[PDB]
Amino acid sequence: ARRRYTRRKNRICYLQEIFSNEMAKVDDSFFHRLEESFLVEEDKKHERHPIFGNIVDEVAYHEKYPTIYHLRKKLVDSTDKADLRLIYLALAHMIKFRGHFLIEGDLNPDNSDVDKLFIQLVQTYNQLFEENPINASGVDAKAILSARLSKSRRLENLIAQLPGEKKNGLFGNLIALSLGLTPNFKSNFDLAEDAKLQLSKDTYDDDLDNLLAQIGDQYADLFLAAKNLSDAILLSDILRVNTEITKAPLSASMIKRYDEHHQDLTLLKALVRQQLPEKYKEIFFDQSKNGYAGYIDGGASQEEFYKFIKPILEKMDGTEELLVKLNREDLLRKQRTFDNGSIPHQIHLGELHAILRRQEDFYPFLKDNREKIEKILTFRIPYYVGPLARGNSRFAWMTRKSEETITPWNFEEVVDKGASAQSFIERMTNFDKNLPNEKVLPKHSLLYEYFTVYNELTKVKYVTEGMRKPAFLSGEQKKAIVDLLFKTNRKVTVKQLKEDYFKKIECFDSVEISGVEDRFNASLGTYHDLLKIIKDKDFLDNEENEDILEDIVLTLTLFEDREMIEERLKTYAHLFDDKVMKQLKRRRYTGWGRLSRKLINGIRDKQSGKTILDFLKSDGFANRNFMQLIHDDSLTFKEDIQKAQVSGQGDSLHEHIANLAGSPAIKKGILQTVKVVDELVKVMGRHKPENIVIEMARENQTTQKGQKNSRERMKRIEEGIKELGSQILKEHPVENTQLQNEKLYLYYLQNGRDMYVDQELDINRLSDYDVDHIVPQSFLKDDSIDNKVLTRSDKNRGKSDNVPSEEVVKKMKNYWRQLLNAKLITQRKFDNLTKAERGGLSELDKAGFIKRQLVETRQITKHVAQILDSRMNTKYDENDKLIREVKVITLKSKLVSDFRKDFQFYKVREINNYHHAHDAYLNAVVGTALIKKYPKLESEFVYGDYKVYDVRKMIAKSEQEIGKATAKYFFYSNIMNFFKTEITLANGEIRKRPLIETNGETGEIVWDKGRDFATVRKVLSMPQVNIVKKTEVQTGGFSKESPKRNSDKLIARKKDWDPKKYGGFDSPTVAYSVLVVAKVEKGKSKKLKSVKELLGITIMERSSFEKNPIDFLEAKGYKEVKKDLIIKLPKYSLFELENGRKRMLASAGELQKGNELALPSKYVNFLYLASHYEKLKGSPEDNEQKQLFVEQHKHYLDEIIEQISEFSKRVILADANLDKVLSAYNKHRDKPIREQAENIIHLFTLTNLGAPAAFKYFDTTIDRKRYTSTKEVLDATLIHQSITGLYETRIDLSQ
RNA sequence: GCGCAUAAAGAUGAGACGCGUUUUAGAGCUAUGCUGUUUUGAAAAAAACAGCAUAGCAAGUUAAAAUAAGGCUAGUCCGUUAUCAACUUGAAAAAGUGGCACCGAGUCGGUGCUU
After folding, report:
1. Is A1280 annotated as a binding residue?
2. Is A916 annotated as a binding residue?
């Protein structure tokens, strides 16, 4: 934003410098008046009227030119010598609002009507195809393509106008291309490969040449007709019927807007004064009622204005036209509105050239520098250049050929565009992990494709019908495979390799591949692209040409601009024809591989003398894979990759964390946990612990679900409808290229039937149909298919603030179950569709989490695992392997969760933050006991190191659970049930478990089922748990970004701009509060009394205060200031007063609750079971006993009420609010136990640590109790604090 | 444990476009009434001179300023975000700093050695 404003201002400044000498001849203090335009007449240096200075001429300008567009159109058409100031105003106004540069080239005002160009389009389509010429048949195009709605929705009606032509058809695709959609002509022109075009992209010209040369010189005028059609379709609201009236279509259209505004204004005034004369004072005077005063002088928008006046209009018998204009959205529209984001810069450039050409016959200087001004308007900084810095920006990369201030005329000379784009892309590409200082080859390298092909073919094992044992394909065999099939087709399926090679060359009756499934992963696409472009196989097949090939790929990847690619390849223009040079430069590639060139064919092996590519291409008897090649002491590769870099280089205990990859959201958390761990080892005897157990977010899903969610769209759809038996695919077949639209994917997901209405959806109104969320966006933000459903209209869902009403579930349950058996919707989707009848959505299901926090947790766990793996284990053994004094153990979330669930040790997080420390304790105990219990399976849990321990051989059943997923879950249940007291198996029968369950081979008691659970019970019931919030200084924006007032809270917007006479900012964010003690004057006698208080240091003030503190305090209005009594107090500074009542410094004028109600485990588990938190599924018997236990212990309710009352009267000072709570509980004492439990749970947020926020108990809105006075902190107990809350330093604030 | 195909996601950094905000310029008016009023004077009365109030009206679209205060590094550059516990050194970086056998456990209390 800052750079934007500065560069625009400088462009205006450029035009001013160009006009400097002449403006001085016209008006000496013109620019002075323009720079002081903000100032009032009382403080204006020169005249308040900008242009002429006097009053009358300004009034004359406002008369003859109501808008700027009247002067615009006037200067564009007329060739008369106008005043220089007006010319300057027009040009500067054009520069100040240039327009978008989204459309490359130029749109010379052609027909400027959809009708003519559409007729030309139909003419081209009829002359092109005599197979089926399609006419427009008199469809009004300039209303069917200019309607204010979706482009695809416009395509729907457009293709509906002519029956018999499908939307993917050549006519439908062409009118989709005119609308800015993404059509395709692979089925229209019957091209062998896919080839889609789009007008918006800048590669459209090269793609056009590509597709045209692939199909011939025949169909080409149709796309330029569509181009000018789009040029005429952009100005829908700004349509000026004829292009010959002026050369400024936009300006005359704006004049039309002004006119319609005036007409509808006088109209509305007359009509109101006629029918409702009492309402005129509200529409046209009240600015805070969305009337015309609120629309114009007020802050109301066009939508709010229309919504406000629509019932006022329709409640009058007249107006007629105003209702139509409201629906057509062109009622009293202004000129500077919201819809101008579509305006391209080309029309402003056109009007500029017209004004210049019409005024260059008088003044010589603008006739001399008209191309300079055109360069000013046309200038656009390339994205690959970046900041135009002179070495003073950490974001720049641009290299200066010279050292001048870069201007739009010498831009091409000062800026090395080549080196700037080069440095732009190289700074983003990664390096090889094996070879750190070396870069990486592009993604289209022929050597790299040969690498992945040979690597994927080193395990394609061949089994002959007569062969006795499987043997991998030999070196010559691989080359045979490549040359016969992998070099002929784009991608070869395993079935194709089996049928088209083995039977033709080896003539084997049957093949048996044990290396690749379904189809081959690797391919040789670049080879086929080159052979189709350069049409010379010999160059790509030649081994000597590989350096030229790698450089060509490098050029086509590093650059995109046709001129740049053409310049980089002028040295290679002798090997291919100029037309071939055009086709190659037209083609451009994106992406980069993962490995270097020196790794593939640079690094040779000592024993062999061949490279990695050769070993993958041929290794003889044992065609070893990449991992076997690298991890082989017999070769030299392992030795030479180890010379990489140095991990133990200069990285402090900080820095290294801020040197990590990813988002900064993770770095904070990481720094916190690592410093916590360091303190933990530092406290307990300054020696390393036995074990360290951590929790990882990686859990083991089943094979069926993991393949069902990752089932590619055509796979899941085809299998789904085939299992269902419906013929929706035979009626409308589409591939995944045009399937990326939301509602179409949803349409094919629901088998052409609405999930609510149980009716057939139609391909016409696709964007008109509503996509509805199962759970509303008020609760959670979800865009995934698990929450969305395509419906005809969103009013059939039921309620707008909850999961679909019972009318739809009890009417669509059969359809949802039939969609569940067809494998179309997932189990979670059906559960959400069926959650309505399960209880709907309670207020407990707030669900504030966002998926990014999930992948963020995965990120922080993956990073910490490899940070901790190297920070705790430092020494190495005698065989060069790290000594693991501390083991980092990774416990899955499922085990600890089930451990809390299967032993009545439930957790309700919202009471306090003790459940985290409880989880930590449970992870530690479960981890150490588990690893002591079974050391043969202990290798799977520790971070880093691992034993082979193949799960296939563990449970090699007839079932074949293997393939890990199913096997890992069955193995997980098998090892997890051994810790329990009674073992019930899903495998077959039972066995009672020993209360100790120690392992005979270890001979050590691993767990006591009678006393360790009691220590868990105690820990879960322990009152003292160290919960500490990080006292951090607030940083950031100076204040809230949102008139003049007589208050001191206003902040001067500029230096000399007084907020009392100009208006200013408000609500400054206090960075950190400062405790001061001095003397100020008091009373009429102005006595210096000793005072102490909290001073608010805002973010803007922080630098100025931290520089000279004493001078700042003396400037504030203090006398005799204690220099040694200036305490810097961040937010959340802990303070304690009476009966363990703690308060945290929320601000310089607000505090926070600092105490937690230490409640025993019994009430917690009771609340869990009573409020019905997880539907407590198991065997019905124990569920019914627990239900009985809920009905019996109904006194726990009143006991909780007592607990809250004492804690609130002791700390919270909840008084009147607490009374309202008690009254609500007495009023609702008759309500069922579950609801009262849920609402008791609701009440805990009042006792939560930190800021006080509002909540509800039933219907009783319980607001927040803010602490508006910070006087009591001044004589409290300062608690200067430490990271585990163990080292408490207390300060009695009495000094 | 990588080379890989499909379908997604994130993150980064540039380049630009729509407003908006608040000021000023939109030279808005009419009548009536009020006082001070050079006022014709010795006063009265305004031309209400000055404002005030009452009503009634009328237009109303846009132009300009800046857009974190600002900074200097004067660049067409920087400045809203990571990055801050207490504490002693050390310019900073960085380092160090608070025990433990045992009994209880209300925001913890003791205890052997013993800080």
Report:
1. no
2. yes
Burial class (CB in 10 A: 0-12, 13-18, 19+), A1038: middle
Concatenate the DSSP letters of all residues of A496-511 into one string: HHIIIIIIIII--S--
Q: What are phi and psi of A51, to 5 degrees?
A: -70, -70
Nearest-5° Cα angle at A629, A626 to A635: 165
Whether CB of A1040 is under 7 Å from strand B: the answer is no
What residues of A are labeled active site?
773
Contacts of A527 (CB under 8 A, 6+ apart): A446, A449, A487, A540
Radius of gyration of chain A (CA): 38
- Phi, psi for residue A1152 in degrees, rounded to 5: -135, 150
- Between the alpha carbon of residue A1263 and those of residues A142, A1212, A1214, A1245, the distances in Å are 56, 13, 11, 11
| A 653-682: CB within 7 Å of strand B | 653-655, 658, 662-664, 667-668, 671, 679, 682
Residues in chain A: 1295
Report the C-alpha gap between A613 and A601 in whole angstroms.
Answer: 7
Phi-psi region of A724 (alpha: psi -120 to 50; beta: other; left: phi over 0): alpha
Identify the residue whose tokens are 């040969």.
A450
Strands A1066-1068 vs A1133-1136: parallel, antiparallel or unpaired: unpaired
Residues 576-595 of A with CB under 7 A from strand B: 593-595
Tell me which residues from 273 to 302 on chain A have a beta carbon below 7 angstroms from nucleic acid strand B: 273, 277, 280, 284-285, 292-293, 296-297, 299
Strand B at less than 7 A from CB of A521: yes
Query: 3-class DSSP state for residue A390?
Result: coil
Structure-solving method: cryo-EM
Please name the amino acid found at residue A128: L
CA–CA distance from A651 to each of A329, A669, A676, A682 (Å)? 62, 19, 19, 21
A556 touches A565 (CB < 8 A): yes
Residues 6+ apart with CB under 8 A from A865: A694, A696, A888, A890, A943, A944
Resolution (A): 5.3
- Cβ(A336)–Cβ(A345) below 8 Å: no
Diameter over CA atoms, chain A: 116
* Residue with smallest Cα–C1' gap to B60: A296
Specify the amino acid at residue A895. L
Instruction: Tell me whether residue A699 is annotated as binding.
Output: yes
* Amino acid identity at A1058: D
Cβ neighbours of residue A210 under 8 Å, at least 6 residues apart? Answer: A195, A583, A586, A587
Question: Beta strand A1039-1040 with A1066-1068: parallel, antiparallel or unpaired?
Answer: antiparallel
**Is A99 near strand B, with its CB below 7 A from some atom of it?**
yes
| Measured CA A275 to C1' B13 distance, in angstroms | 59
CB A1020, CB A905: distance < 8 Å: yes
A782 is in an annotated binding site: no
Token pair in block for residue A586: 């037209």
Burial A1232-1268 (b: 16+ CB within 10 A, else e): ebbebbbbbbbbbbbbbbeebeebebeebebeebebe
Distance (Å) of CA A1196 to CA A851, A1167, A1246: 37, 9, 19
A729: tokens are: 């695919």
Smallest CA-to-CA distance from A567 within A548, A585, A586 is with A585
Amino acid at A847: A
Phi first, then psi: give them for residue A1222, nearest 5 degrees: -60, -40
Is A360 annotated to bind a ligand? Reply is no
Return chain A residues 437..466 having CB < 7 Å to nucleic acid strand B.
Answer: 448, 451-452, 455-456
- Token pair 């062109």 is at which residue? A330
Which structure tokens are listed for A1233?
């136990």
A930: its two tokens: 């588990």
Task: With beta carbons less than 8 A apart as the criterion, state whether A619 and A608 touch.
Answer: no
Nearest nt (C1') from A1134 Cα: B85
User: Do A939 and A949 contact (CB within 8 A), yes or no?
Assistant: yes
